[PDB]
Design a binder for this molecule. Structure first.
Ligand SMILES: Cc1cc2nc3c(=O)[nH]c(=O)nc-3n(C[C@H](O)[C@H](O)[C@H](O)COP(=O)(O)OP(=O)(O)OC[C@H]3O[C@@H](n4cnc5c(N)ncnc54)[C@H](O)[C@@H]3O)c2cc1C
Ligand SMILES: O=C([O-])CC(=O)C(=O)O
Ligand code: SF4
Ligand code: F3S
Ligand code: FES
Lengths: 130, 577, 243, 119
């Protein structure tokens, strides 16, 4: 018969709305939804692409819808946020010691970001120039 | 109450206690060990140390050099056969710590680096960055988890110890969360409760440091030894008393007055040494005693700067530069930035001499055993005979691991050949502790425990400071006697059972008051100036091996009076002139 | 010069009396120096002696001041009143059961920390032989992770520990990682049990907030992630064992 | 106590894929959303570069066949994995999520793998 009543605070399904850190984390995690959406869109593309000129031209018409464009514009910003954030976090998986000091993360963050840029170009160059 | 069976009980989970707990679980794998602490072990004040631990390591060093550095450092009030034991067991203990995973800072060759502390000629202070204490305790605590034989009573406040027929038989302690009394019956008991600096208003110590272990020893007619010796640290922040390590001055930092004059040269510590080159024992690396004293001398001249928090001198570290700053002393930067709002690269730091270490403590013999058989005291709450009249910088942590080991080992021997005490007589002891506690709870008188506390701090700081006169010593003895009376009129308003701090802080205050009276009387009586004890009055300004080459023993009688006795100081290889 | 006075909201709870925690208000005089701890002292000293809280070191090295200030895990002695002129609310450390006033049940923490075997293992060296050799480079591996003072702020900050109180937690995982990456230690295999658990590293979604709150700049989030990499290695190297 | 003998979580496999999918998507997703999402449908590209004929030509080639696979597959495993814990984060309970999401991922993976071998 302890005299203590340990009071436990509940945790609401909305714990995250309070602190802006939690909000960002949620929103960052939230980048997945469009990231998956794009992959769906690509399946449509891939599939309608196999079904000859008629299907594909109708698929490009689907992307031509004013809303879908807006949606895709959001999807780009989404995946851009994901990239920005992802790169800030990837280095923290690495534990490299240089000259008796734990390194990171800026050298990695930059390295990675560069690779993104070189890709962006090479791809845009391949896709458009020929 | 709920009674627990243990083979031995240790009060305190600081460096000392933990080293004892570990030692005993190794010395005997089968015993049940009760480790008791009023905070979770990692909170013990040992956690706050920065400078490091002394142990003989360099090839040009010798145990004799470390022996002679300590004895002279304690003004020959050292028990020399204890120092010899101490010096020799240091390198084993620091090595053993390293083996348990203490992150000692290293030479690039992978061997452990050392630096210099407490004006020692040959550098022997092993250090983990500037957080040596945090590392030691966290390594010591973490290590201890591997031994099941240690059962921990975390956040249990020990009220009294159980004694019958001149032998210890256990202790009574409150379960701090439940607020429920518990008997621990141990046939040998170790006191690892640490120092009692907190009885001073301005000090470097954590809250836990209230001297309860000393208070309990007092109550059973065990003398406190060499109590008047309270070590001040030259450089503490004003009004918080937070420690700025010697490391600062060891990295060649400077102390200046309102004129920005590096005054230490005028106090026998000339000549001034160029900023880059900091020579040991000269200026800011000079002898602790004189440095602390130098502040007082400067204070009367109107040379000391005046701030809302107090009169200060400046620890200018600007000239150090951020490269060595953040590598060697990074933690110091953080404190200055936060607690006094001073950026140590841009600005100078206010420092004031501050109460830091209790050379005094529970009288023990070379095995850490007290006048009471089975009862041991180890670490700061003890007086082993190691520090004498003044501790040597970086020797305290070392003491913990050296004698913590011994105390754990020694108490195992005693408990294993103790036999059984009078059960009826023992249980009747616990009844009293319980009743005595209740008597305090009921006690009415509408006196605030906190204001009595506040006043005791002031009396100590003014009457038992770096420089001591009879008048002010007396004033303090008087004031304490007054406060002892007022304590009997304290009324504890919180009568709750669940983690009642009001009650606990008040108990702590009780010990505080008793112990303070030990410090105060001891000081008044010692008519000489040795070590930390510096009297200004005529005929007491100098050291006296003629009349005062002896240990001060302070007893507390049942009538509540502090009676003093004196004991000889044992010498081996190094007598004075 | 009469010091500025400040209204402070402090959430009290007494198990004997109170059904549920309720706020209380205290007016404390403060200056540029006054830390919340300082203020908390004044309360018990002058206004509410019945107040109970955890403190000791006073220099933010012991770790006991764990409490929430305005929905942020903070140290009571590293929290400064001047910074809260707009208003200030003080509940006990989050994600732990409140025993009394600002004191919380810390058992789970201690238990977690214990479960990961945080001590040098399997090193057969002895003290008479001399210390182990470890380079500055070899220390760098775990050194930062070794600086945890056990405040438990990480636990109040991490939302996953909120949702799952069986999650062994940032601090406790970090400490495991610290011993893993110490060259002196050969017990990695003993710790992986707890780490590989669903309640181990894998309860962490990398919210990373623990690292933000860490008073001692330990960055436990990094430990947890390097932990994930390490656990995965072990998951593979375990699956590839036909034996 | 805490569980002395805890089950090894089977999560490493899923986190692994998420790790690669996160990494792929991170680098190569933006440009693609630009190409397929914006440039193609708005006609903002030179001549016949993203015309039916040329796309097909690329998609059918082996290099393209592999690329399209990964560009669809990897972002799913990353994405769905993230959503799975988001359910738990929102305190919303979904029966056999573990099977639901990774199932969906496997399903789509299969559908994708079929697509890139010509339907
Ligand atoms: C800021 C600072 C820096 C220092 N730096 C150094 C240094 O660099 N080198 C060096 O050698 N020395 C240093 N010292 C001195 C040295 O750290 C101490 O002398 C030493 O840590 C004392 O440890 P201890 O084991 O005696 O007890 P402590 O570490 O003080 O622990 C005491 C224990 O007793 C328990 N306790 C107390 N009262 C009760 C009670 N009533 N009931 C139950 N339990 C109780 C406590 O909970 C605690 O666990 C420093 C001191 C300070 C203040
Ligand atoms: O005084 C000591 O023994 C060592 C100390 O606290 C310091 O780092 O200055
Ligand atoms: S990691 Fe930081 S937050 Fe967490 S307990 Fe350790 S010191 Fe406190
Ligand atoms: S906040 Fe919690 S989710 Fe992981 S990154 Fe820190 S442990
Ligand atoms: S008081 Fe020791 S952590 Fe803040």
């Amino acid at each position: 018969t302890t005299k203590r009543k340990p009071y436990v605070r509940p945790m609401t399904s909305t714990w995250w709305k309070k602190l802006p850190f939690y909000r960002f984390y949620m929103l960052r995690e939230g980048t997945a939804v469009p990231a998956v959406w794009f992959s769906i869109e690509l399946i449509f593309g891939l599939f309608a692409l196999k079904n000859g000129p008629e299907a594909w031209a109708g698929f490009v018409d689907f992307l031509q819808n004013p809303v879908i464009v807006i949606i895709n514009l959001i999807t780009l910003a989404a995946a851009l946020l994901h990239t920005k954030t992802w790169f800030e976090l990837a280095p923290k998986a690495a534990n490299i010691i240089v000259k008796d000091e734990k390194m990171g993360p800026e050298p990695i963050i930059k390295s990675l970001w560069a690779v993104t840029v070189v890709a962006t170009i090479v791809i845009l160059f391949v896709a458009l120039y020929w | 109450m709920q009674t627990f069976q243990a083979d031995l009980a240790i009060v305190g989970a600081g460096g000392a206690g933990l080293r004892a707990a570990i030692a005993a679980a190794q010395a005997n794998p089968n015993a049940k060990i009760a480790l008791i602490s009023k905070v979770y072990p990692m909170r013990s004040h040992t956690v706050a140390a920065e400078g490091g631990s002394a142990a003989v390591a360099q090839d040009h060093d010798s145990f004799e050099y470390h022996f002679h550095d300590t004895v002279a450092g304690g003004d020959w009030l050292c028990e020399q056969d204890v120092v010899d034991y101490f010096v020799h067991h240091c390198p084993t203990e620091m090595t053993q710590l390293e083996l348990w995973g203490c992150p000692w800072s290293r030479r690039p060759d992978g061997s452990v680096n050392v630096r210099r502390f407490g004006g020692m000629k040959i550098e022997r202070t092993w250090f983990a960055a500037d957080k040596t204490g945090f590392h030691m305790l966290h390594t010591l605590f973490q290590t201890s988890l591997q031994f099941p034989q240690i059962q921990r009573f975390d956040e249990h406040f020990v009220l009294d110890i159980l004694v019958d027929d001149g032998h210890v038989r256990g202790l009574v302690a409150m379960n701090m969360m439940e607020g429920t009394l518990v008997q621990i019956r141990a046939n040998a008991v170790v006191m690892a409760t640490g120092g009692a600096g907190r009885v001073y208003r301005y000090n470097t110590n954590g809250g836990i440091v209230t001297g309860d272990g000393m208070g309990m020893a007092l109550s059973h007619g065990v003398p406190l030894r060499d109590m008047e010796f309270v070590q001040y640290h030259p450089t503490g922040l004003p009004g918080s008393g937070i420690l700025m390590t010697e490391g600062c001055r060891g990295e060649g930092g400077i102390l200046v007055n309102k004129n920005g004059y590096r005054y230490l040269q005028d106090y026998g510590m000339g000549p001034e040494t160029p900023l880059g080159e900091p020579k040991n024992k000269y200026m800011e690396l000079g002898p602790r005693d004189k440095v602390s004293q130098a502040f007082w001398h400067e204070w009367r001249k109107g040379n000391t700067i005046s701030t809302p928090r107090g009169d200060v001198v400046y620890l200018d570290l600007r000239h150090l530069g951020e490269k060595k700053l953040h590598e060697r002393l990074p933690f110091i930067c953080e404190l200055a930035k936060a607690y006094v709002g001073v950026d140590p690269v841009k600005e100078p730091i206010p420092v004031r001499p501050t109460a830091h270490y209790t050379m005094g403590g529970i009288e023990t013999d070379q095995n850490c055993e007290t006048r009471i058989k089975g009862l041991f005291a180890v670490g700061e709450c003890s007086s082993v005979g190691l520090h004498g009249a003044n501790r040597l910088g970086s020797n305290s942590l070392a003491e913990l691991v050296v004698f913590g080991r011994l105390a754990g080992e020694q108490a195992t021997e005693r408990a294993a050949t103790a036999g059984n005490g009078n059960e009826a007589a023992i249980e009747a002891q616990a009844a009293g502790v319980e009743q005595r506690l209740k008597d305090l709870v009921n006690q009415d008188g509408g006196e605030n425990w906190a204001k009595i506390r506040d006043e005791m701090g002031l009396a100590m700081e003014e009457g038992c400071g770096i420089y001591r006169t009879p008048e002010l010593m007396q004033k303090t003895i008087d004031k304490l006697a007054e406060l002892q009376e007022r304590f009997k009129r304290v009324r504890i308003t919180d009568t709750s059972s669940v983690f009642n701090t009001d009650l606990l802080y008040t108990i702590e205050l009780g010990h505080g008051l008793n112990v303070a009276e030990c410090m105060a009387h001891s000081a008044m009586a010692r008519k000489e100036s040795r070590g930390a004890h510096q009297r200004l009055d005529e005929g007491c300004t100098e050291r006296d091996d003629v009349n005062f080459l002896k240990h001060t023993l302070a007893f507390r009688d049942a009538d509540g009076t502090t009676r003093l006795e004196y004991s000889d100081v044992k010498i081996t290889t190094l007598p004075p002139a | 010069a009469e010091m500025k006075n400040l209204k402070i909201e402090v959430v009290r709870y007494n198990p004997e009396v109170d059904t549920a925690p309720h706020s209380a208000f205290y007016e404390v005089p403060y200056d540029a120096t006054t830390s919340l701890l300082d203020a908390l002292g004044y309360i018990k000293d002058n206004l509410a002696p019945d107040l109970s809280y955890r403190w000791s070191c006073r220099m933010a090295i012991c770790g006991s001041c764990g409490m929430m200030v305005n929905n942020v895990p903070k140290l009571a002695c590293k929290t400064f009143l001047r910074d809260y002129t707009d208003g200030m609310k003080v509940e006990a450390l989050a994600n732990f059961p409140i025993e009394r006033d600002l004191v919380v049940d810390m058992t789970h923490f201690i238990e977690s920390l214990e479960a990961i075997k945080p001590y040098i293992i399997g090193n057969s060296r002895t003290a008479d032989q001399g210390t182990n050799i470890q380079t500055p480079a070899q220390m760098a591996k775990y050194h930062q992770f070794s600086g945890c003072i056990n405040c438990g702020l990480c636990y109040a900050a991490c939302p996953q520990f909120g949702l799952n109180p069986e999650f062994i937690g940032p601090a406790a995982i970090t400490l495991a990682h610290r011993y893993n990456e110490d060259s002196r230690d050969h017990g990695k295999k003993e710790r992986m049990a707890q780490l590989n658990s669903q309640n181990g590293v894998w309860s962490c979604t990398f919210v990373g907030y623990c690292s933000e709150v860490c008073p001692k700049h330990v960055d436990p989030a990094a430990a947890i992630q390097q932990g994930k990499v390490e656990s995965s290695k072990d998951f593979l190297i375990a699956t590839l064992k036909p034996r | 106590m805490i569980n002395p003998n805890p089950k090894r979580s089977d999560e490493p496999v899923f986190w692994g894929l998420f790790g690669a999918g996160g990494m792929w998507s991170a680098i190569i997703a933006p440009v693609m959303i630009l190409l397929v999402g914006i440039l193609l449908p708005l006609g903002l590209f030179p001549g016949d570069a993203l015309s039916y004929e040329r796309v097909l030509a690329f998609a059918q080639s082996f290099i393209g066949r592999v690329f399209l696979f990964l560009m669809i597959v990897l972002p799913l495993w990353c994405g769905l994995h993230r959503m799975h814990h988001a359910m738990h984060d929102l305190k919303i309970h979904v029966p056999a999520g573990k099977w639901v999401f990774y199932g969906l991922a496997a399903i789509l993976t299969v559908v994708t793998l079929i697509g890139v071998v010509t339907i």
